[PDB]
């Protein structure tokens, strides 16, 4: 059994950062050094565990989260960050044990007039909790009077698009991000290195 990283990394379309995908990966043998030596990634940062050791460690379950952001926000995908991604879209815990991979995708996820398929939650009542997900589009109430699903002053549609374009800056260009998480639970280990 070989862990199915091939359709997680090389998926034809990634999600948005508010409605991010997850995938459970169990009962398989994964070689992490073959990923680390792809060298086609802008960012490969492992927290809580050192690479070159992932083949010598064995975990109950691992999870692969996939989402697209802009280049300047990959700094926010990390333990202890703060922003409009670490608070409202994707939050990583202080006890993270995994690896954040990220790579430029201006070829696939950008269009001449703009690509409005990729969204992010701009306003939210409170900060996300570690690994929580929020896909509601309820009108955000910014004042004292309720917003019964109708827009106006004081009431905002919370999501908003990135509007990727082929010639945006390098910090405003699409970046595909895959967060691998490893869990050590009191149970037989199923996903394990070679």
């Amino acid at each position, epitope marked *: 059994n070989l862990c199915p990283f091939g359709e997680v990394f090389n998926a034809t379309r990634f999600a948005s950062v508010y409605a991010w995908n997850r995938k459970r990966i169990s009962n398989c043998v994964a070689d992490y050094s073959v990923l680390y030596n792809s060298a086609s990634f802008s960012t490969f940062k492992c927290y809580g565990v050192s690479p070159t050791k992932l083949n010598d460690l064995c975990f109950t379950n691992v999870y692969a989260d996939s989402f697209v952001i802009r280049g300047d926000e990959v700094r926010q995908i990390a333990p202890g960050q703060t922003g409009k991604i670490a608070d409202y879209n994707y939050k990583l815990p202080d006890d993270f044990t995994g690896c954040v991979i990220a790579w430029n995708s201006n070829n696939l996820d950008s269009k001449v007039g703009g690509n409005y398929n990729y969204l992010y939650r701009l306003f939210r009542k409170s900060n996300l909790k570690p690994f929580e997900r929020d896909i509601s589009t309820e009108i955000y109430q*910014a*004042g*004292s009077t309720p917003c*019964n699903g109708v*827009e106006g*002053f*004081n009431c*905002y549609f919370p999501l*908003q698009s990135y509007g990727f374009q082929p010639t945006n800056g390098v910090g405003y260009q699409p970046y595909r991000v895959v967060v691998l998480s490893f869990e050590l639970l009191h149970a037989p280990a199923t996903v394990c290195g070679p």
Partner: antibody
Amino acid sequence: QVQLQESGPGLVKPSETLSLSCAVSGASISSYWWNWFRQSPGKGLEWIGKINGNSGITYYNPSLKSRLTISKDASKKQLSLTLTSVTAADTAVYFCATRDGNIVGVADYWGQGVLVTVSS
Amino acid sequence: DVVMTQTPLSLPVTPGEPASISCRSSQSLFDGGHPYTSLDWYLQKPGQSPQLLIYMVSNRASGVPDRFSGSASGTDFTLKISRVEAEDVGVYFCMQSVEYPYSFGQGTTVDFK
């Protein structure tokens, strides 16, 4: 392409009832919180008050209440302001507005305003 | 309820130079720990309806040139035109949508120098 036009009487006596109507185009009334603002001659704006679009909930200015009524006709594609007993300070240009949050930015759909004088 | 105090009453500025306008709220408009509250920055040219520039405390409206910026430090809200141009003349004011009556600031007339 949402376009609003205010309309109403140009001149009213110092005790007659002011009835303005905002005609909306390019959008359904039921979607927005329609605000009514007024601007005194050479001064800042004032918030007269708002009406919900689908429902009928309406909020007014506390100082200007007891003389105010905001309503609508969704089938007629209209909103309406009426202010009773305009007394020496209800001389202004009137706007209807609403802010449209979206997937592409935020545009807030103001009106062109109409003039109302109080004196005869 | 809430009254706004705009610090520059008139701001004579020369093109190509930074311009900073301030708006101090009567009370704190930040209830939940948040970056944004409801406070808009508007540009009114003489004889027209206002034009939205910064809708939330820092978010820029659609179709607004990138020279305008907004931010807040507590009860103070600052707007900055980092490079004034020929079109930035008019009145700038400060509208809070948090409370009941949507109060405004006095206003600041940007003057050619």
